[PDB]
Amino acid sequence: TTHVTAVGSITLHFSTSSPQANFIVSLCGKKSTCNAECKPPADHIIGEP
Amino acid sequence: NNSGRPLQETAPFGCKIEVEPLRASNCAYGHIPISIDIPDAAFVRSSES
Amino acid sequence: QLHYTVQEEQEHGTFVGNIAEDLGLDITKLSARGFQTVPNSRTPYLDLNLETGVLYVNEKIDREQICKQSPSCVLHLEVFLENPLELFQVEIEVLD
Amino acid sequence: PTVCPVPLAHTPTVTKWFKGITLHLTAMRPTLLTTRKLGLRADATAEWITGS
C-alpha cells in the first residue's frame, strides 16, 4: 500500500525473469502499461531462491 | 562396516529427516490449491477510498 | 579455572565454596538446565547439592592416603549443564 | 551420556564461473565433504580429504 496526496510520485521496486518488461500496474483500481528492455545479469552465483 | 551414508544426506527436494516420531520436514514440491472465505466487515465500500 | 582450599580434618560437610554464585549463572533456573556431575570425575570425598550449588565434604580427609598417589596434593572435579552445553573445572587442595 | 568437544576446520574460499564453483581446501588430518542437489535427483558424493 502507499500514502497518497494531491499531486506527487512514488517509486516501487520489482523483480522479473523476462528479457523485457511489458506488464500492467493497477493503483487504486486504475491501470497503466509499462515497457522497456532488460539487460542480463552480471554475477554468476547468489544465495537466494 | 558396510552401512553407507544415512538418509539425512540423500533425500531429494532438500528435506530434513528427524526422528521421535519419524518425519520429513520442510520439503519443496508441487502446487497447492486453496479456497478461503473472508469476513464481511473487512470490506470498505467505494465511497470512501 | 577455579580454585578452593580445604583444611585438614574435616567432619562430613562443613563448607567449601559456592560454585553457581562465583560463576554468575543464577539460582532458581539451574534446576531445569540439567545441573550434573561428570562421570569422569568425582573423588569419593566431596558431594554436590544440585539445588543451592554448594560443596559438601563427604568423608573425613586423610592426607596420608589422598596424596600418596598424586604427590602434589590436589583434587579434580567437573560439572556441566545443557541448553546450551557448558563444561567447567574446579580444583581443591589439602592444606596442613 | 555426556558432552564432548570437537575441532573446527579452516573455512574455504570459493571461485565462481558460469554454472559452477571451485573450492580451495586445507586439511592437515583426514576430514569429510558431502554435497547433494536440491532437485528431483540427488547425486550424492562423499570423500575423505588430506592436504591442500
Describe the fold and architecture.
This is part of a larger assembly, with 2 copies of chain A (49 residues), 1 copy of chain C (96 residues) and 1 copy of chain D (52 residues). Chain A is mainly beta and 49 residues long. Chain A has strands at 20-21, 24-27, 30-33, 36-37. Chain C is elongated and about 40 Å long. Chain C has 96 residues and is of the alpha+beta class. Chain C has helices at residues 19-23, 30-33, 63-66, and strands at residues 3-6, 36-37, 74-80, 88-94. Chain C has a 4-stranded mixed β-sheet with strand order 1-4-3-2, with no helix packed on it. Chain D is built from no helices and 4 strands. A two-stranded antiparallel ribbon of chain D has the order 1-2. Chain D has a two-stranded antiparallel sheet with strand order 3-4. In chain D, strand 1 and strand 2 (20-24) form a beta hairpin. Chain D starts with 12 loop residues before the first strand and ends with a strand. Classes of the chains: A mainly beta (49), C alpha+beta (96), D mainly beta (52). At the B-D interface, loops of B face loops of D. It is classed as viral protein. The entry lists the keywords weev, VLP, E2-E1 glycoproteins, receptor, viral protein.
Entry keywords:
part of a larger assembly; 4 chains; A: 49 residues; mainly beta; two-stranded antiparallel ribbon; 0% helix; 24% strand; elongated; C: 96 residues; alpha+beta; four-stranded mixed sheet; Structural polyprotein (chain B); Protocadherin-10 (chain C); Structural polyprotein (chain D)
